[PDB]
Amino acid sequence: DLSEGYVFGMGNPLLDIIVDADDFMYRKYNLKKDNIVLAEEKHMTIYDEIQKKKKLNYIAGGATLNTVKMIQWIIQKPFVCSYVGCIGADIQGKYIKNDCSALDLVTEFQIAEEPLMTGKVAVLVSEKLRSMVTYLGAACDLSLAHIEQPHVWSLVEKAQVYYIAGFVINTCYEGMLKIAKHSLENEKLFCFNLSAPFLSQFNTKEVDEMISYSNIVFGNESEAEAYGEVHGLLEDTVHATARYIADLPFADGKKRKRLVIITRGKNPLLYTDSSDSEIHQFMVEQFKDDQIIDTNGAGDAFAAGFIADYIRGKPMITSLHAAVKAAAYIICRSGFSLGSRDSYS
Ligand SMILES: Nc1ncnc2c1ncn2[C@@H]1O[C@H](CO)[C@@H](O)[C@H]1O
Ligand SMILES: [Cl-]
Fold this sequence. Notes:
The protein is an alpha/beta fold. Strands 1, 5, 6, 7, 10, 11, 12, 13, 14 and 15 form a ten-stranded mixed sheet that branches. It has helices spanning 24-28, 45-50, 63-75, 91-102, 144-147, 150-158, 169-185, 197-202, 204-211, 221-230, 237-247, 298-310, 316-331, and strands at residues 7-11, 14-20, 35-38, 57-61, 81-87, 106-107, 110-111, 118-125, 130-137, 161-165, 189-193, 216-220, 259-264, 267-273, 280-282. The protein has two domains: 1-14 and 61-118 and 136-345, Ribokinase (UDP-N-acetylmuramoyl-L-alanine:D-glutamate ligase, 3-Layer(aba) Sandwich), CATH 3.40.1190; 15-60 and 119-135, Adenosine kinase, small domain (2-Layer Sandwich). Helices cover 38% and strands 23% of the residues. It is built from 13 helices and 15 strands. Residues 11-12, 62-64, 165, 167-168 line the site of chloride ion.
């Protein structure tokens, strides 16, 4: 039985705009399979462009928010989870806020000065490729000032577990660094997601600094590969990355266990920790082609499923099964959609 506000997240609350994309779109915007890029000026027309498409699916997104609200949904006790992010003063932001309240997720949103609008993600779906283009928008305005308000910082102080995705490096590194230091100094549980290859490539300093306060690190194969390359881990890159991340000193230099989990799609996921000489494979339930509805957000669900069980005392293997279950539930649904809790099985 977990205390209220036991779990705290901060991140970028975003609206996902899911569209069946034509094949030209990927060439036109130079987009890649299973990837995400932050919108540059050359990308900006995509939002007006996909808005001309029918069958648009609008749904609340944001990597950290996805994970934290599913932890809340899984555990099913009201107000166990807390979330902080920055939205705009528009209908999109209000929809995202109402979605959180419907889930019994305690929030303290910062509202961006008008007319800065709530961030959005163009999620381009096709049989050939899936790809995301993110316009952070209001999420950038998330500040240390808002986080340090007595009524918001108190959510951080009461939490024993934190989840922050690497994506927040781009929006409020100062805040996530402050929370990370608070966690380590108080011997709490800080969970960190590598989130995307571009973070390890262009924000290497920030990723490695975050790892040094993280008790648990989540990643996927492409993130491990990009991380490995940037660190000169030429051979055996994915295994080497898992070992390297697990063994990085903590910021206070204190001897401590860090757990690293690298997912690999349909292939066995890898896990190890700093006390473990070996890297373990964990077999994953094989999916048929027709079973897969939408894998977008599966990694976010995986993290939620793992943490929700792990923080309630379930052993490593049991928690991994819970993580796969979470991801599988999301894979069989469109966008990060959480239905009635009774049907979770
Ligand atoms: N730059 C970003 N920051 C936070 N979340 C993001 C970012 N880009 C994509 N996402 C989210 O990642 C989710 C898929 O893991 C989508 O719901 C999408 O909204
Ligand atoms: Cl996020």
